[PDB]
């Protein structure tokens, strides 16, 4: 697994070389599909290793949702030093996996035949995606996970081929996804940055480090935030704000080159506040007009050395739209709100306009690149600041 483009050129991709993606290091100047829409699709599921079987996870069954939570809680993404692991909650998983248009056959699980234990997963959800001058119905792929005891046995390529087949059956032939590893071939490369909210805890669990020329007392003063936000008229998003949030987001996203195209129903799903999942605040001015909004989702991480201890509480910048409030002010209030709600750290990528505030608001650069990818769509790559899409 190459995490660097230099590593990636010294690697061969036995699976990805067979897929309709551009080759690494080839410069793309065209825009369109690699292969045509298929007018007949394999009806039979791909073959799994002996002893494993496919299943479609109906998350409306609480027991099945808990099985998925447990698979991910124990086997999903860890940080580069294997000290933290994502701890997606069941309620978050419902938010991320049942948006408008979701299909249970696109919650694609692998179970042990004899025990029925869940040991692998991958998911698709539908999304309309604007990529340069084209809008395409696509899927977003997420939650690719193979049990630690099943790794390095070529199960991930089978999971990818099977979700591909199941998406093809529904008439969809493009996808978007992110990954921490370099594959053929990123359409954009983004970097996470981090803003300490509770510096004492971040240093104690070694999420961050004391600068060695700075004391703890000094670090606490440096990152201290006001107790209340400064922007006039900031308040939680409400049902009555759904249309204007939709309108604000649609107009704001036009300036980027890879963006979602959301219906008003999708806007309600992705932004309407749900405690411990998604937070959205709007700025309603002295005229009663909503002019700006900020949003972040809740994604804690298990502290692997102390599974007993409370998870590390992280907020992830989602979509932030400014038309009257300066973005710097909007994000300052996002930090204060996250601190108020008990988060330890606030995370943001360097995409969209985020580079204009990261250093000024005392974010520090993170240790991993997030690559963005399109499947069966060959187009030029773009800089992070033109990426306008944030996944979970």
């Amino acid at each position: 697994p190459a995490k660097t483009m230099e590593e990636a050129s010294k690697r061969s991709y036995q699976f990805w070389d067979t897929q309709p993606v551009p080759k690494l290091g080839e410069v793309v100047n065209t825009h369109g599909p690699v292969e045509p829409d298929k007018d007949n699709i394999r009806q039979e599921p791909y073959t799994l290793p002996q002893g494993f079987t496919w299943d479609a996870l109906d998350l409306g069954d609480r027991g099945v949702l808990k099985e998925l939570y447990t698979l991910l809680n124990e086997n999903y993404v860890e940080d580069d030093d294997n000290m933290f692991r994502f701890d997606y909650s069941p309620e978050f998983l419902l938010w991320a996996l049942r948006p408008p248009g979701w299909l249970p056959q696109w919650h694609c699980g692998v179970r042990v035949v004899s025990s029925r234990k869940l040991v692998g997963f991958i998911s698709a959800i539908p999304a309309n995606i604007h990529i340069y001058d084209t809008e395409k119905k696509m899927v977003e792929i997420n939650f690719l996970c193979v049990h630690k005891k099943l790794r390095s046995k070529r199960v991930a390529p089978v999971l990818i081929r099977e979700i591909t087949r199941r998406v093809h059956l529904e008439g969809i032939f493009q996808a978007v996804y992110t990954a921490g590893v370099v594959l053929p071939k990123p359409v954009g490369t983004c970097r996470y940055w981090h803003r300490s909210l509770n510096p004492r805890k971040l240093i104690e669990v070694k999420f961050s480090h004391l600068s060695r020329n700075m004391t703890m007392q000094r670090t606490m003063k440096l990152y201290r935030l006001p107790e209340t936000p400064k922007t006039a008229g900031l308040r939680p998003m409400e049902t009555k704000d759904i249309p204007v949030v939709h309108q604000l987001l649609t107009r704001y996203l036009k300036q980027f080159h890879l963006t979602p195209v959301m219906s008003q129903e999708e806007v309600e799903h992705w932004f309407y506040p749900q405690e411990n999942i998604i937070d959205t605040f709007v700025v309603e001015n002295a005229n009663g007009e909503v002019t700006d909004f900020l949003s972040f989702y809740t994604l804690p991480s298990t502290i692997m050395n102390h599974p007993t201890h409370k998870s590390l509480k992280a907020a992830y910048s989602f979509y932030n739209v400014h038309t009257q409030t300066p973005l710097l002010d909007l994000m300052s209030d996002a930090l204060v709100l996250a601190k108020m709600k008990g988060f330890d750290v606030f995370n943001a990528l360097d995409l969209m306009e985020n580079k204009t505030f990261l250093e000024k608001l005392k974010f520090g650069i993170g240790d991993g690149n997030l690559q963005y990818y399109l499947y069966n769509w060959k187009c030029p790559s773009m800089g992070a600041e033109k990426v306008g899409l944030v996944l979970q």
């Binding site: 999903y76 993404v77 860890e78 940080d79 580069d80 030093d81 000290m83 933290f84 692991r85 994502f86 997420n142 939650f143 690719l144 996970c145 996804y177 992110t178 990954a179 921490g180 996470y192 981090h194 971040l202 999420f207 961050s208 480090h209 994604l299 991480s301 995370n347 520090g364 650069i365 993170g366 240790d367 991993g368 690149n369 997030l370 996944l391 979970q392």
Partner: peptide, 8 residues
């Protein structure tokens, strides 16, 4: 999927 990053 997402990436779990921390301070460089």
């Amino acid at each position: 999927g997402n990436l779990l990053s921390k301070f460089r």
